[PDB]
């Protein structure tokens, strides 16, 4: 529905489903195993992954698509910080998937901002 301040929830659930089904999301689908990778927390202050984002959305624990978008962007900025080399296939996967995410989220954000303006 036009001007729906709830539309983002279904739009983000659908977008997360597309990301999970994309091969480029494979490294980012679950929390980094901090026992397997003991220097991860030396580099990364705030781990994030797509299963955490999907679970938080399904629980109703995001107030706005901005809060969801901040967590997704943290998945990609964490990957850049831990895996900074342009040579890494993991760097390439996060670049491709981040660009996909940013192309799809822009209209979710602008629709929300318009709905919120309407609601006020
Ligand atoms: C999500 N990760 C975790 C990881 C584990 C092992 C090797 C590289 C990476 N890089 C990432 O960006």
Swiss-Prot record:
Transmembrane segments: none annotated. It is found in: Nucleus. Coiled coil: none annotated. The modification Phosphoserine is found at residues 2, 92. It comes from the Eukaryota. The modification Phosphothreonine is found at residue 46. Residues 3-108 form the Bromo domain. Expressed in myeloma and epidermoid carcinoma cell lines. Interacts with IRS1 and IRS2. Interacts (via bromo domain) with acetylated lysine residues on histone H1.4, histone H3 and H4 (in vitro). It is linked to Chung-Jansen syndrome: An autosomal dominant disorder characterized by developmental delay, intellectual disability, autistic features, anxiety, hypotonia, obesity, and dysmorphic features. Probable regulator of the insulin and insulin-like growth factor signaling pathways. Stimulates cell proliferation through regulation of cyclin transcription and has an anti-apoptotic activity through AKT1 phosphorylation and activation. Plays a role in the regulation of cell morphology and cytoskeletal organization. This is PH-interacting protein.
